[PDB]
């Protein structure tokens, strides 16, 4: 567990967990992009579009955005499993696949932004308001957390004529 209980990696998985909660709130908060035609303002989200002035109501209307976000969440609950079973039975190596999963999570979530971004270009004003910055920060959190955890799990660049990756401890 020498790489499984380091402080520099425990802080990274802490940042990973913060990214997880920000991504879990960015997928359900359908109030992350406002439209301003001008007194019928609509709040966008990956699932439900709402209207406000009186007549408060959300509905649906680009399946790509929500589907890809679901893919990202699937990567999250695929990666956290292998992450937690890395603490038992000397299974430290498992920290490497988990990290990569998290990385891809971010990537998928990232393109979600893009596609929704593109949708915002087809419709009035626009102001990414509440959970858009949440997702923009969740992407960076998950992406850099995955990358940093991956490098902290991979042993080290040899740096000596005798050292080598894939050594005997």
């Amino acid at each position: 567990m020498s790489p499984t209980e380091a402080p520099k990696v425990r802080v990274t998985l802490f940042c990973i967990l913060v990214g997880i909660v920000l991504a879990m709130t960015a997928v359900v908060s359908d109030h992350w992009a406002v439209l301003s035609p001008h007194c019928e303002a609509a709040h966008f989200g990956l699932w439900r579009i709402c209207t406000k002035r009186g007549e408060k109501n959300c509905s649906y209307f680009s399946i790509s955005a929500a589907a890809i976000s679901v893919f990202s969440l699937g990567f999250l609950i695929m990666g956290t499993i292998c992450a937690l079973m890395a603490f038992r039975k000397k299974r430290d190596y498992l920290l490497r696949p988990a990290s990569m999963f998290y990385v891809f999570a971010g990537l998928c979530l990232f393109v979600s932004l893009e596609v929704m971004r593109q949708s915002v270009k087809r419709m009035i004003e626009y102001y990414y308001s509440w959970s858009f910055a949440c997702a923009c920060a969740a992407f960076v959190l998950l992406f850099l957390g995955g990358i940093s955890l991956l490098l902290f799990s991979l042993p080290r660049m040899p740096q000596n004529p005798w050292e080598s990756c894939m050594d005997a401890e």
Binding site: I68, Y93, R96, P97, V103, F104, C108, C165
Partner: peptide, 29 residues
Amino acid sequence: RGYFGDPWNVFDFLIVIGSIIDVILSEID
């Protein structure tokens, strides 16, 4: 347990799952 030791295999794993995500990300669209 020996697969995830060699860093080359970690890199291969990364690229494989990435290409798989792309090959279905185009089919979803």
